[PDB]
Symmetry: C2
């Protein structure tokens, strides 16, 4: 058995979408169609400091100590600090400070699920420590990033999140975790770009909307749109993990999904899975936005700490990252939150 022993987060102030429109950051008619109410925005907290904050909260509510942590896994989507500097070792130094391994994992918005999968396999194959620490953090307040316009699908958001995974107990049990790729979709996020030299070394950043426009111009006629590929894989991986967990939709109380705008959320997740509206976390997600890799665990912590799920309830975590890859987990809530 593997459990989530502690969970924690760093959530910056929520910037109202109204105010973004008022200040010329966000198009009024994008606000109208997305349904976004606000996004978490950190003016100046380094992404690794957000991870440290979340990790300290998760550890000291976990009932485990630093000596229980066999590895630290940090994931992210956006730059973390000086090139060639190890953010994950900075996090280790300010959280656990034991000579255990510190590794960075990247899988887009699935970074925390990928990290959880690595930690699970290690806790099964390595007897040395009872627990593992998984963190993430990202801050999009960097030169030239327009967080409200970079993509037409979502607003970029800043946050940190962390979980302690443990073989000896916790507040929720991890029942299943799996993922599957459709790597033919990789081209979507390089359309119109030169691979070499990489764009950031040439002043090119998160121009997702531009890349998507190139995709529309170039999309071969008679080809199902890419959203179908994404939604089909989302449905497949969810069916697989429910089967692996031996739980039915009947038993799923909440679906913790990414913080996309409503049209993309529906097309990629809610419609392919036919999610009942009461099982979504829409009215939370539309105040946060799309963090690098924290969305699923911010949603889990929210529905647990507000009492919307309790012992015996099951929660589905579902995301889809660039590449593309669809990933899901099923957890069983075992304890009520304080």
């Amino acid at each position: 058995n593997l459990y989530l022993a502690g969970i924690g987060s760093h959530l910056p102030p929520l910037f109202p979408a109204e105010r973004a429109v008022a200040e010329g950051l966000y198009d009024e008619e994008a606000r109208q169609s997305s349904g976004m109410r606000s996004a978490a925005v950190s003016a100046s907290t380094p992404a690794p400091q957000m991870a440290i904050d979340a990790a300290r909260a998760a550890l000291e509510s976990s009932g485990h100590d630093a000596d229980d942590i066999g590895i630290l896994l940090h994931s992210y989507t956006h730059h973390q600090g000086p090139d060639g500097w190890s953010a994950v070792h900075y996090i280790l130094n300010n959280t656990v400070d034991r000579p255990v391994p510190a590794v960075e994992i990247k899988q887009g918005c699935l970074g925390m699920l990928a990290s959880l999968d690595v930690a699970a396999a290690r806790l099964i194959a390595n007897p040395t420590h009872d627990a593992a620490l998984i963190t993430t953090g990202d801050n999009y307040s960097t030169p030239g990033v327009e967080r409200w316009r970079a993509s037409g699908l979502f607003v970029l958001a800043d946050a940190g999140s962390a979980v302690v995974l443990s073989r000896r107990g916790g507040f929720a049990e991890l029942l299943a975790l799996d993922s599957l790729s459709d790597s033919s979709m990789e081209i979507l996020h390089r359309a119109g770009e030169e691979l070499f030299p990489p764009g950031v070394t040439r002043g090119r950043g998160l121009n997702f909307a531009e890349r998507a426009e190139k995709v529309r111009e170039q999309w071969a006629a008679g080809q199902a749109p890419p959203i179908k590929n994404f939604g089909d894989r989302v449905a497949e991986v969810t069916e697989r993990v429910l089967k692996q967990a031996d739980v039915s939709w009947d038993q799923i109380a909440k679906v913790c999904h990414v913080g996309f705008g409503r049209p993309a959320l529906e097309a990629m997740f809610l419609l392919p899975l036919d999610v009942p509206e009461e099982k979504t976390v829409w009215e939370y997600a539309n105040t946060i936005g799309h963090t690098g890799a924290a969305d699923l665990f911010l949603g889990l912590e929210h529905v647990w700490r507000t009492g919307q799920v309790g012992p015996g309830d099951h929660v589905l975590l579902i995301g889809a990252s660039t590449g593309m890859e669809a990933g899901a987990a099923v957890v069983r809530i075992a304890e009520a939150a304080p």
Copy 2:
């Protein structure tokens, strides 16, 4: 038992250190002290394309097919393509193209050992596939990088490398793999730098020599140099993995080490471990330089394919990444190379 079933690489043309001096890229009398003869330099091949080339060579010399590969793990140290694009799914799409997971792993120059550790635990905990694919690639021919001066410890080099790890056989047996951190050393690679916004978004790059000089200026009195911290940890992890493998130095035929300049190589690795000169790969390393994360497996493939090691010989892989972390592996050669 776990085995390396296949290995492959992409090695660009070797750029003579003489020519680097002649063109004003390299100080003459750094060449003199480092002992570097050349460095592998790729003018324009994208790092993921070098990884694809290495992976195809590793797969088809492995005796496994695409259906055996349960995961692709790609590691690197330097930018890979557009921000928000998945290099690893591009590599998957052009090598395996099965819907298996594709994940990026980063641990500086230990990226392939970290990936090998993740694949090993997955092959032990997941029965679904017999094998896993691990790749790396990096190209430092990007704006503003001065590959011969960025650090005084080494010359930056370009390459791809890949290995297939298998539970069912191969040319070498993986006996031990471990690592240990000293995260108090993280400060070395941010000295004099602002964490936020990250330097690359402000046009600041791989200025390692500058950071090192700031460390010299600020280092408090009575405090052991950082090289001692690094070298002590290298000796600790090597003793641990030899003990885990139940092999003695007596049995080690070759030490596959990083492609540092000679002074740094001696201070951090050869002197702490007291390596006999015949067991090093110095006269190969001094023609390649320091790749992002391929050094250890370029050295392994070299001593294996040139016949310098044969069945029954043991090989130690040892590296140390920024952060810092020391990692080592011990393999027993089981097959000679064709």
